[PDB]
RNA sequence: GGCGUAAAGCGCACGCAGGCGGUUUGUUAAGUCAGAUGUGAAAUCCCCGGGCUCAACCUGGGAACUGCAUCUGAUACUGGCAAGCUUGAGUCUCGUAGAGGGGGGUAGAAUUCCAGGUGUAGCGGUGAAAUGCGUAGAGAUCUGGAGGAAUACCGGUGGCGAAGGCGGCCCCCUGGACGAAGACUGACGCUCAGGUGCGAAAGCGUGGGGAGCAAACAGGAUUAGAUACCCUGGUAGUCCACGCCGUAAACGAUGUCGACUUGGAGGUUGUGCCCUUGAGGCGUGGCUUCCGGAGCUAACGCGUUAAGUCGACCGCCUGGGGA
């Protein structure tokens, strides 16, 4: 992307081991990841992107802390990406015969909330009563149509969002994420190369990602 | 413990063109140096089993010094043992 | 403390395919560049380069290709303590066939081969596959 | 096949005789590999022709019995022998820390003992109590003095030592390890039966020693009983001159030796470099604690100080109850 820019000076310190491979460290008070190790990929990474999205996979896009939620929502609630924004709830993706179930609760507080002892004229307190109903929308509400398994998985950091990549990890599906040195080189198959201190200007690579998967006439 | 002032009274005599000091014949005769000097040292004193193993291993390693000098030449190893005390 | 050569040679090779890398190193001497000539002969290793006024070093590279590694078994077989030896119909067939063996020989290291078509037999130093 | 525990790794140091050992050349041919000629009795397996249907059996022809000897090639590795090396191993210039050892010392406190004062019925002790100490003046408080042992604090995240173990200050004697910048030898290495030398507590010997703690013992009890717990007294033993003893849950229950290889946090000791113009910053050897990853393991753990990856040598071992 060759934007990128200047920094002086992190991570002296701060690295996972299982990265000796892909980094420079014991010298010159660095520790940092080989560049001939992420960007000679991340210019031949998208193309296995749209090689899922060309043949319908079905693609889920995470990021729930709120400096980069707001870039995510707006590239996936007018998109054919799933999201998640907010909060993961227990096994949302690998207790799938739950979790259809949890979708099926979506309408059965919404349909209990019009019921009985609440299709009253007063709801006030009432509808306290049946506040799990939006305590799992919080979880379901990018996602509830999405169903069965996912075909790729996009995250917005490889260490602040692991819930989702422990449960793509074991439900199989290919991990494209944004790289740091105390991340897992393990549980991605796809790195990003990317700074925390620019999490509001790595926009234009969700842009990129949001337009990959949408290139085609397929 | 053994100065480089009392070394200055062994590589003299047991050297030959200098610096000849890692070589077997000097060698031999700094560890009989050491040997002589820590086998007195004891007496007075005795109760030191730390001092006694030093000396066991400075004699360990000549006795091994002394054997490989006689297996590359005899007439080298001969002409050492009449100026170092050895067999009586 | 070191009596074989051979006896850190081949751990290096199974351990860093294990690791996954693409150059192993080791210390150099002449059976293990008579070794290494042979392996890429029968193209078990792409290259092999030597190097050191100290201490001569040598570096080899492995293979694989897309990304699975090509070398299938790497063994020794033959110790200097319990040496194996060989006779011209009694030279193995490594793998069953799908790999094969490394001999010293009167002639100087090679396959076997290059062995049983010499119509001569030896002492085992590799199996591979 | 197996040695962390389930069952076996020696408590420890050194090392002869054994096993094992880098590398450049030649040469020997013990050993290997290759080729022959002899031999490997006959029955007999297995192939296969007869004889009784099948076959036991009688056989007619083959094969194998990798062997062994005697002749003869290959000339690579191992042993052997010489010649040649080093970047395996070793010692060192200037230097570094340490409760290591030995010999010397050297200092303080209370229960105690010794001669008394001041002074009155208390003291001592347990979950409860009681023997017992005390009117001979206790307990306690003072004056002047004797006796024996150990070394408060800092002390830990720490060191050292072969282990067992070892903290004071001060003066000698001394083993080993370790850093910086170089060099002289030239495989001189790794291991080790039986040896050759070590000891914590307790015990044995000869002579001293005796505050505190205390087996044994005598009481108080307590109790159904108490021979014990718990309380009052108390010798052996603890200390020293030494001389013996040689054993341990001697324990991170992991034999010694070498290489390869994710870390983090932290301690401890040298040290390369930037006017250290240096408090700072950038490095780098030695030793080592906790947390833990690939691998290993039945499991817990081991985890670059590995129970991992692989090699040399040694020591052991095949169920309890009996023993």
Known sequence: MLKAGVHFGHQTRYWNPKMKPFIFGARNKVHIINLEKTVPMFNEALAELNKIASRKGKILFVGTKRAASEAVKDAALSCDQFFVNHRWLGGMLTNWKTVRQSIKRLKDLETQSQDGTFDKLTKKEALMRTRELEKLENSLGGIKDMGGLPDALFVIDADHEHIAIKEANNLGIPVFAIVDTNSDPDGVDFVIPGNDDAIRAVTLYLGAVAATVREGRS | ?88 | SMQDPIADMLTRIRNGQAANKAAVTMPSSKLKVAIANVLKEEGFIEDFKVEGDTKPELELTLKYFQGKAVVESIQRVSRPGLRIYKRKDELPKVMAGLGIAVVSTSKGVMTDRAARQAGLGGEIICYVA
Do not use: C, P, W
């Open chain 2, 1 to 88: 413990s053994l100065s480089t002032e009392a070394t200055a009274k062994i590589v003299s005599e047991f050297g030959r063109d200098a610096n000849d000091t890692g070589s077997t014949e000097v060698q031999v005769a700094l560890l009989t140096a050491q040997i002589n000097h820590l086998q007195g040292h004891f007496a007075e004193h005795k109760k030191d089993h730390h001092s006694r193993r030093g000396l066991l291993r400075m004699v360990s390693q000549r006795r091994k010094l002394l054997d490989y000098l006689k297996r590359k030449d005899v007439a080298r190893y001969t002409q050492l043992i009449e100026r170092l005390g050895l067999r009586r």
